[PDB]
PDB file of C-alpha atoms and ligand atoms in Angstrom:
ATOM      1  CA  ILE N   1       0.000   0.000   0.000  1.00 52.80           C
ATOM      2  CA  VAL N   2       1.437   3.368  -1.069  1.00 54.73           C
ATOM      3  CA  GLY N   3       0.286   6.446   0.812  1.00 55.00           C
ATOM      4  CA  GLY N   4      -1.761   4.602   3.428  1.00 54.70           C
ATOM      5  CA  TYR N   5      -1.659   4.288   7.193  1.00 56.55           C
ATOM      6  CA  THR N   6      -0.820   1.585   9.720  1.00 56.81           C
ATOM      7  CA  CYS N   7      -4.123  -0.219  10.307  1.00 53.34           C
ATOM      8  CA  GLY N   8      -3.460  -1.284  13.874  1.00 54.08           C
ATOM      9  CA  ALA N   9      -3.104  -4.875  15.027  1.00 54.91           C
ATOM     10  CA  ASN N  10      -6.109  -7.058  14.148  1.00 53.82           C
ATOM     11  CA  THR N  11      -8.340  -4.158  13.102  1.00 55.13           C
ATOM     12  CA  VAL N  12      -8.932  -5.880   9.734  1.00 55.64           C
ATOM     13  CA  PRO N  13      -9.825  -9.335  11.072  1.00 54.51           C
ATOM     14  CA  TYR N  14     -10.722 -10.879   7.692  1.00 56.94           C
ATOM     15  CA  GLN N  15      -7.315 -10.120   6.140  1.00 58.77           C
ATOM     16  CA  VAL N  16      -5.149 -13.161   5.513  1.00 59.35           C
ATOM     17  CA  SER N  17      -1.566 -13.618   4.378  1.00 57.19           C
ATOM     18  CA  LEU N  18      -0.802 -16.419   1.923  1.00 57.77           C
ATOM     19  CA  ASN N  19       2.580 -17.923   2.783  1.00 56.36           C
ATOM     20  CA  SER N  20       4.773 -20.288   0.780  1.00 57.83           C
ATOM     21  CA  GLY N  21       7.838 -19.832   2.963  1.00 54.40           C
ATOM     22  CA  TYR N  22       7.276 -16.062   2.788  1.00 51.93           C
ATOM     23  CA  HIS N  23       4.319 -13.745   2.350  1.00 54.80           C
ATOM     24  CA  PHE N  24       3.340 -13.550  -1.316  1.00 57.09           C
ATOM     25  CA  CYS N  25      -0.343 -12.509  -1.533  1.00 58.70           C
ATOM     26  CA  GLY N  26      -3.256 -11.377   0.562  1.00 57.65           C
ATOM     27  CA  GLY N  27      -6.723 -12.822   0.744  1.00 53.44           C
ATOM     28  CA  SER N  28      -9.997 -12.572   2.625  1.00 54.68           C
ATOM     29  CA  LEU N  29     -11.653 -15.029   4.993  1.00 56.42           C
ATOM     30  CA  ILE N  30     -15.269 -15.456   3.880  1.00 58.91           C
ATOM     31  CA  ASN N  31     -16.242 -18.243   6.305  1.00 57.84           C
ATOM     32  CA  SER N  32     -14.516 -20.516   8.775  1.00 54.28           C
ATOM     33  CA  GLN N  33     -13.043 -22.735   6.042  1.00 53.31           C
ATOM     34  CA  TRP N  34     -12.731 -20.655   2.852  1.00 52.09           C
ATOM     35  CA  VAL N  35     -10.514 -17.822   1.634  1.00 48.96           C
ATOM     36  CA  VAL N  36     -10.944 -15.727  -1.505  1.00 46.59           C
ATOM     37  CA  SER N  37      -7.902 -14.333  -3.293  1.00 49.73           C
ATOM     38  CA  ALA N  38      -6.735 -13.467  -6.807  1.00 48.56           C
ATOM     39  CA  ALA N  39      -6.237 -16.187  -9.417  1.00 46.20           C
ATOM     40  CA  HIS N  40      -2.833 -14.662 -10.241  1.00 46.59           C
ATOM     41  CA  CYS N  41      -1.795 -15.654  -6.704  1.00 47.75           C
ATOM     42  CA  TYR N  42      -2.258 -19.364  -7.465  1.00 50.86           C
ATOM     43  CA  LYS N  43       0.484 -21.751  -6.464  1.00 49.88           C
ATOM     44  CA  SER N  44       0.811 -25.071  -4.707  1.00 51.40           C
ATOM     45  CA  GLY N  45       1.792 -25.495  -1.070  1.00 50.11           C
ATOM     46  CA  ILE N  46      -0.036 -22.493   0.379  1.00 50.79           C
ATOM     47  CA  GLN N  47      -0.263 -21.951   4.125  1.00 50.96           C
ATOM     48  CA  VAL N  48      -2.969 -19.476   5.114  1.00 51.02           C
ATOM     49  CA  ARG N  49      -2.009 -17.161   7.991  1.00 51.43           C
ATOM     50  CA  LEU N  50      -4.871 -15.595   9.944  1.00 49.93           C
ATOM     51  CA  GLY N  51      -4.816 -13.055  12.751  1.00 48.43           C
ATOM     52  CA  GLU N  52      -1.569 -11.488  11.520  1.00 44.62           C
ATOM     53  CA  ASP N  53      -0.272  -8.029  12.101  1.00 46.29           C
ATOM     54  CA  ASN N  54       3.524  -8.238  11.995  1.00 46.46           C
ATOM     55  CA  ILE N  55       4.146 -11.071   9.507  1.00 47.98           C
ATOM     56  CA  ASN N  56       7.696 -11.566  10.804  1.00 48.82           C
ATOM     57  CA  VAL N  57       6.916 -11.876  14.544  1.00 50.36           C
ATOM     58  CA  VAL N  58       4.650 -14.293  16.399  1.00 49.04           C
ATOM     59  CA  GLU N  59       2.472 -11.911  18.427  1.00 45.41           C
ATOM     60  CA  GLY N  60      -0.076 -14.390  19.798  1.00 46.81           C
ATOM     61  CA  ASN N  61      -3.299 -14.122  17.754  1.00 46.21           C
ATOM     62  CA  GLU N  62      -2.182 -16.057  14.666  1.00 45.88           C
ATOM     63  CA  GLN N  63      -3.706 -19.216  13.245  1.00 42.28           C
ATOM     64  CA  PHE N  64      -1.644 -21.036  10.606  1.00 42.62           C
ATOM     65  CA  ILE N  65      -3.691 -23.453   8.479  1.00 42.08           C
ATOM     66  CA  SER N  66      -2.628 -25.306   5.347  1.00 40.77           C
ATOM     67  CA  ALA N  67      -4.764 -25.176   2.224  1.00 43.77           C
ATOM     68  CA  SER N  68      -6.374 -28.442   1.171  1.00 41.24           C
ATOM     69  CA  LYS N  69      -7.685 -27.329  -2.220  1.00 40.59           C
ATOM     70  CA  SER N  70      -7.455 -24.308  -4.488  1.00 41.19           C
ATOM     71  CA  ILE N  71     -10.017 -23.503  -7.176  1.00 41.85           C
ATOM     72  CA  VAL N  72      -9.107 -20.918  -9.812  1.00 37.83           C
ATOM     73  CA  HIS N  73     -12.102 -19.434 -11.599  1.00 38.66           C
ATOM     74  CA  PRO N  74     -12.900 -21.561 -14.675  1.00 38.54           C
ATOM     75  CA  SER N  75     -12.626 -18.556 -17.029  1.00 37.01           C
ATOM     76  CA  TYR N  76      -9.511 -16.899 -15.578  1.00 36.31           C
ATOM     77  CA  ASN N  77      -7.366 -15.434 -18.373  1.00 37.73           C
ATOM     78  CA  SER N  78      -3.811 -14.789 -17.202  1.00 36.72           C
ATOM     79  CA  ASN N  79      -3.078 -12.497 -20.147  1.00 38.68           C
ATOM     80  CA  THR N  80      -5.967 -10.061 -19.598  1.00 39.50           C
ATOM     81  CA  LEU N  81      -6.540 -10.816 -15.867  1.00 37.78           C
ATOM     82  CA  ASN N  82     -10.259 -11.178 -16.586  1.00 39.20           C
ATOM     83  CA  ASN N  83     -11.910 -13.292 -13.863  1.00 38.77           C
ATOM     84  CA  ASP N  84      -8.979 -12.825 -11.477  1.00 37.89           C
ATOM     85  CA  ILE N  85     -10.462 -14.723  -8.541  1.00 40.78           C
ATOM     86  CA  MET N  86      -9.665 -17.967  -6.725  1.00 42.66           C
ATOM     87  CA  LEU N  87     -11.038 -19.861  -3.735  1.00 41.64           C
ATOM     88  CA  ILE N  88      -8.866 -21.673  -1.179  1.00 47.27           C
ATOM     89  CA  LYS N  89     -10.304 -24.252   1.212  1.00 45.80           C
ATOM     90  CA  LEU N  90      -8.571 -24.645   4.565  1.00 43.17           C
ATOM     91  CA  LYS N  91      -7.640 -28.107   5.807  1.00 42.22           C
ATOM     92  CA  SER N  92      -9.436 -27.290   9.079  1.00 36.89           C
ATOM     93  CA  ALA N  93     -11.880 -24.604  10.173  1.00 37.53           C
ATOM     94  CA  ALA N  94     -10.483 -21.411  11.645  1.00 36.88           C
ATOM     95  CA  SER N  95     -11.501 -20.455  15.176  1.00 36.69           C
ATOM     96  CA  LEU N  96     -13.473 -17.232  14.756  1.00 33.44           C
ATOM     97  CA  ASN N  97     -13.191 -14.427  17.314  1.00 34.56           C
ATOM     98  CA  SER N  98     -12.952 -10.634  17.462  1.00 35.86           C
ATOM     99  CA  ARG N  99      -9.527 -10.640  15.747  1.00 38.05           C
ATOM    100  CA  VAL N 100     -10.171 -13.425  13.197  1.00 42.00           C
ATOM    101  CA  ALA N 101     -13.516 -12.999  11.491  1.00 41.52           C
ATOM    102  CA  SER N 102     -15.112 -13.509   8.114  1.00 41.67           C
ATOM    103  CA  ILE N 103     -16.232 -10.723   5.795  1.00 44.55           C
ATOM    104  CA  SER N 104     -19.667 -10.853   4.197  1.00 44.29           C
ATOM    105  CA  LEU N 105     -20.137 -11.279   0.473  1.00 45.59           C
ATOM    106  CA  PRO N 106     -22.112  -8.505  -1.237  1.00 40.13           C
ATOM    107  CA  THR N 107     -25.762  -8.742  -2.169  1.00 37.42           C
ATOM    108  CA  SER N 108     -25.398  -5.893  -4.666  1.00 34.74           C
ATOM    109  CA  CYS N 109     -22.599  -4.173  -6.519  1.00 31.97           C
ATOM    110  CA  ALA N 110     -21.175  -0.967  -5.092  1.00 32.09           C
ATOM    111  CA  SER N 111     -21.577   2.288  -7.011  1.00 33.37           C
ATOM    112  CA  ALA N 112     -18.870   4.720  -8.030  1.00 34.03           C
ATOM    113  CA  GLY N 113     -18.188   7.153  -5.216  1.00 37.30           C
ATOM    114  CA  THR N 114     -18.501   4.548  -2.461  1.00 38.94           C
ATOM    115  CA  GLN N 115     -15.590   4.727  -0.026  1.00 38.47           C
ATOM    116  CA  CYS N 116     -13.735   1.471   0.598  1.00 37.51           C
ATOM    117  CA  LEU N 117     -10.884   0.098   2.700  1.00 37.16           C
ATOM    118  CA  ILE N 118      -7.958  -1.631   0.970  1.00 34.47           C
ATOM    119  CA  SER N 119      -5.309  -3.380   3.045  1.00 36.42           C
ATOM    120  CA  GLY N 120      -2.153  -5.394   2.635  1.00 35.39           C
ATOM    121  CA  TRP N 121       1.536  -5.954   3.287  1.00 34.60           C
ATOM    122  CA  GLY N 122       2.649  -4.784  -0.151  1.00 34.44           C
ATOM    123  CA  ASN N 123       5.332  -2.318  -1.170  1.00 29.94           C
ATOM    124  CA  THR N 124       4.884   1.172   0.302  1.00 31.08           C
ATOM    125  CA  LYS N 125       6.925   3.109  -2.305  1.00 32.83           C
ATOM    126  CA  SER N 126       5.974   4.134  -5.840  1.00 33.16           C
ATOM    127  CA  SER N 127       9.670   4.183  -6.794  1.00 36.00           C
ATOM    128  CA  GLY N 128      12.075   1.793  -5.164  1.00 36.29           C
ATOM    129  CA  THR N 129      10.959  -0.810  -2.663  1.00 36.11           C
ATOM    130  CA  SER N 130      10.188  -0.913   1.050  1.00 37.34           C
ATOM    131  CA  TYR N 131       8.062  -3.723   2.367  1.00 37.52           C
ATOM    132  CA  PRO N 132       6.347  -3.165   5.712  1.00 36.54           C
ATOM    133  CA  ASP N 133       6.055  -5.910   8.272  1.00 35.79           C
ATOM    134  CA  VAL N 134       2.735  -4.622   9.715  1.00 35.64           C
ATOM    135  CA  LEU N 135      -0.545  -4.334   7.881  1.00 35.82           C
ATOM    136  CA  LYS N 136      -1.221  -1.107   5.959  1.00 36.09           C
ATOM    137  CA  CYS N 137      -4.615   0.413   5.151  1.00 34.36           C
ATOM    138  CA  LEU N 138      -5.926   2.852   2.561  1.00 32.53           C
ATOM    139  CA  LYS N 139      -9.328   4.477   2.212  1.00 29.64           C
ATOM    140  CA  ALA N 140     -10.188   5.042  -1.436  1.00 31.50           C
ATOM    141  CA  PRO N 141     -13.322   5.598  -3.535  1.00 30.38           C
ATOM    142  CA  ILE N 142     -14.619   3.466  -6.363  1.00 29.42           C
ATOM    143  CA  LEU N 143     -14.149   5.392  -9.604  1.00 31.80           C
ATOM    144  CA  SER N 144     -16.738   5.640 -12.356  1.00 31.84           C
ATOM    145  CA  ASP N 145     -16.587   3.085 -15.148  1.00 33.25           C
ATOM    146  CA  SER N 146     -15.894   5.887 -17.631  1.00 35.98           C
ATOM    147  CA  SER N 147     -12.853   7.230 -15.775  1.00 32.49           C
ATOM    148  CA  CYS N 148     -11.569   3.667 -15.362  1.00 32.64           C
ATOM    149  CA  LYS N 149     -11.924   2.888 -19.077  1.00 32.36           C
ATOM    150  CA  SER N 150     -10.371   6.253 -19.975  1.00 33.05           C
ATOM    151  CA  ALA N 151      -7.365   5.415 -17.784  1.00 34.43           C
ATOM    152  CA  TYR N 152      -6.896   1.923 -19.284  1.00 29.90           C
ATOM    153  CA  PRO N 153      -8.273   1.955 -22.842  1.00 27.45           C
ATOM    154  CA  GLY N 154      -9.257  -1.486 -24.112  1.00 28.06           C
ATOM    155  CA  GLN N 155      -8.352  -3.311 -20.894  1.00 27.16           C
ATOM    156  CA  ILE N 156     -11.272  -2.931 -18.449  1.00 25.90           C
ATOM    157  CA  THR N 157     -13.913  -5.658 -18.597  1.00 24.08           C
ATOM    158  CA  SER N 158     -17.262  -5.818 -16.824  1.00 21.29           C
ATOM    159  CA  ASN N 159     -15.497  -7.900 -14.139  1.00 23.52           C
ATOM    160  CA  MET N 160     -13.186  -5.085 -13.050  1.00 25.87           C
ATOM    161  CA  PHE N 161     -13.455  -1.719 -11.360  1.00 27.43           C
ATOM    162  CA  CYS N 162     -10.977   1.047 -10.576  1.00 28.17           C
ATOM    163  CA  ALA N 163     -10.548   2.527  -7.130  1.00 29.70           C
ATOM    164  CA  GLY N 164      -8.136   5.134  -5.910  1.00 31.47           C
ATOM    165  CA  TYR N 165      -7.069   8.623  -6.924  1.00 30.58           C
ATOM    166  CA  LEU N 166      -6.443   9.954 -10.409  1.00 31.76           C
ATOM    167  CA  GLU N 167      -3.882  12.383  -8.935  1.00 31.78           C
ATOM    168  CA  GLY N 168      -1.741   9.441  -7.807  1.00 31.76           C
ATOM    169  CA  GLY N 169       0.148   9.067  -4.553  1.00 29.75           C
ATOM    170  CA  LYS N 170      -2.167   6.499  -2.923  1.00 30.05           C
ATOM    171  CA  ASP N 171      -2.630   2.985  -4.281  1.00 30.22           C
ATOM    172  CA  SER N 172      -2.199  -0.707  -3.716  1.00 28.55           C
ATOM    173  CA  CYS N 173       1.106  -2.156  -4.892  1.00 28.07           C
ATOM    174  CA  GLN N 174       3.199  -5.307  -5.307  1.00 30.60           C
ATOM    175  CA  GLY N 175       2.434  -7.806  -2.561  1.00 29.13           C
ATOM    176  CA  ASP N 176      -1.060  -6.459  -1.937  1.00 28.41           C
ATOM    177  CA  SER N 177      -2.301  -8.809  -4.705  1.00 28.31           C
ATOM    178  CA  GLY N 178      -5.306 -10.862  -3.731  1.00 29.77           C
ATOM    179  CA  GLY N 179      -6.250  -8.690  -0.746  1.00 25.98           C
ATOM    180  CA  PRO N 180      -9.616  -7.208   0.154  1.00 24.98           C
ATOM    181  CA  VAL N 181     -11.442  -4.084  -0.925  1.00 23.85           C
ATOM    182  CA  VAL N 182     -14.224  -3.694   1.649  1.00 26.17           C
ATOM    183  CA  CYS N 183     -17.006  -1.142   1.290  1.00 30.01           C
ATOM    184  CA  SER N 184     -19.895  -0.721   3.728  1.00 30.50           C
ATOM    185  CA  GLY N 185     -18.913  -3.930   5.502  1.00 33.01           C
ATOM    186  CA  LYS N 186     -18.978  -6.118   2.360  1.00 33.41           C
ATOM    187  CA  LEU N 187     -16.187  -7.580   0.216  1.00 32.57           C
ATOM    188  CA  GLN N 188     -16.523  -5.764  -3.116  1.00 34.29           C
ATOM    189  CA  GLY N 189     -13.041  -6.096  -4.611  1.00 34.75           C
ATOM    190  CA  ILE N 190      -9.841  -8.114  -4.856  1.00 33.47           C
ATOM    191  CA  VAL N 191      -6.494  -6.408  -5.511  1.00 33.67           C
ATOM    192  CA  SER N 192      -5.764  -7.432  -9.102  1.00 35.15           C
ATOM    193  CA  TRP N 193      -3.541  -5.218 -11.280  1.00 37.31           C
ATOM    194  CA  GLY N 194      -2.418  -1.766 -12.297  1.00 37.18           C
ATOM    195  CA  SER N 195       0.230   0.130 -14.204  1.00 36.98           C
ATOM    196  CA  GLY N 196       2.879   0.599 -11.569  1.00 38.17           C
ATOM    197  CA  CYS N 197       1.670   1.946  -8.225  1.00 37.66           C
ATOM    198  CA  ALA N 198       0.338   5.379  -7.286  1.00 37.25           C
ATOM    199  CA  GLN N 199       1.041   6.866 -10.724  1.00 35.32           C
ATOM    200  CA  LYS N 200      -1.027   9.772 -11.992  1.00 36.92           C
ATOM    201  CA  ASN N 201      -4.032   8.688 -14.086  1.00 39.37           C
ATOM    202  CA  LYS N 202      -3.303   4.996 -13.331  1.00 39.61           C
ATOM    203  CA  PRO N 203      -5.499   3.880 -10.423  1.00 39.19           C
ATOM    204  CA  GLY N 204      -5.531   0.320  -9.169  1.00 38.78           C
ATOM    205  CA  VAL N 205      -7.835  -2.212 -10.843  1.00 39.79           C
ATOM    206  CA  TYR N 206      -9.837  -4.689  -8.754  1.00 39.11           C
ATOM    207  CA  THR N 207     -11.829  -7.840  -9.424  1.00 36.95           C
ATOM    208  CA  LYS N 208     -15.545  -7.032  -9.136  1.00 35.65           C
ATOM    209  CA  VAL N 209     -16.631  -9.575  -6.512  1.00 38.12           C
ATOM    210  CA  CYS N 210     -20.381  -8.960  -6.860  1.00 37.77           C
ATOM    211  CA  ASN N 211     -20.257 -10.684 -10.273  1.00 38.64           C
ATOM    212  CA  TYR N 212     -18.974 -13.896  -8.647  1.00 39.06           C
ATOM    213  CA  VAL N 213     -21.259 -14.434  -5.660  1.00 33.71           C
ATOM    214  CA  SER N 214     -23.234 -17.231  -7.316  1.00 36.20           C
ATOM    215  CA  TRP N 215     -20.054 -19.057  -8.361  1.00 37.59           C
ATOM    216  CA  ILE N 216     -18.586 -18.666  -4.875  1.00 35.08           C
ATOM    217  CA  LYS N 217     -21.690 -19.953  -3.118  1.00 33.25           C
ATOM    218  CA  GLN N 218     -22.187 -22.916  -5.443  1.00 34.58           C
ATOM    219  CA  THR N 219     -18.503 -23.861  -5.254  1.00 36.23           C
ATOM    220  CA  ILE N 220     -18.409 -23.742  -1.446  1.00 36.92           C
ATOM    221  CA  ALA N 221     -21.613 -25.786  -1.224  1.00 33.04           C
ATOM    222  CA  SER N 222     -20.103 -28.668  -3.229  1.00 32.56           C
ATOM    223  CA  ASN N 223     -16.468 -28.779  -2.101  1.00 32.73           C
TER     224      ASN N 223
HETATM  225  C1  F5U E 301       4.835  -2.563  -9.073  1.00 30.15           C
HETATM  226  O1  F5U E 301       3.542  -2.519  -9.668  1.00 30.15           O
HETATM  227  C2  F5U E 301       2.693  -3.575  -9.421  1.00 30.15           C
HETATM  228  C3  F5U E 301       3.143  -4.869  -9.738  1.00 30.15           C
HETATM  229  C4  F5U E 301       2.349  -5.969  -9.531  1.00 30.15           C
HETATM  230  C5  F5U E 301       1.079  -5.758  -9.003  1.00 30.15           C
HETATM  231  N1  F5U E 301       0.088  -6.652  -8.692  1.00 30.15           N
HETATM  232  C6  F5U E 301      -0.986  -5.968  -8.191  1.00 30.15           C
HETATM  233  C7  F5U E 301      -0.728  -4.629  -8.172  1.00 30.15           C
HETATM  234  C8  F5U E 301      -1.636  -3.540  -7.694  1.00 30.15           C
HETATM  235  C9  F5U E 301      -1.433  -2.181  -8.349  1.00 30.15           C
HETATM  236  N2  F5U E 301      -2.499  -1.266  -7.904  1.00 30.15           N
HETATM  237  C10 F5U E 301       0.606  -4.472  -8.691  1.00 30.15           C
HETATM  238  C11 F5U E 301       1.431  -3.360  -8.917  1.00 30.15           C
HETATM  239 CA1   CA E 302       2.675 -12.389  13.306  1.00 28.82          CA
END
């Protein structure tokens, strides 16, 4: 996250870190046994880390649970990033409490202008690299479809939205991939892609979760 603030330990209780020997992507806990992330995060041998703040120090509220199955969306296109969503099933159910909690799926899509919270352990610099060990947060609005398409001609599908600031300076960045965009207490987005981070006229692009609720619910019910 570039231009954000330190969230505070366990203030984003649905945020997860995906770990394959190191943090490599975020995700969101949507019930006691399932995590949603980006399809571009896919790999084998994922351990899901819940209740994290400092990802390099055991602070006492963590739960570490191996993934038993990953399901990339059937229409994910790695070249265009269309349908950039994946589900991960945990080998055992997480113990839910005030610091580890699921986030609700949306019943409707959020409109442009809605303020959302984006969070992650990604790079905090737009040039150069500095990775934080504690979770960073950013409040940002959903941008209109027309501004999003004007910023990324030819590249925005109906399964994507832009959020952030056309002036630059505040954005998600490398290592935030797969993490949550939460608006009005519902998961509306997944950190997906962008052109660099925090550049003028290049806001972050997010998977539009409301288009996937039926797929998520049917997949969870059968797996
Ligand atoms: C350094 O630029 C990158 C590189 C990879 C990335 N993945 C996801 C994002 C979010 C950008 N809003 C991103 C940014
Ligand atoms: Ca920790």
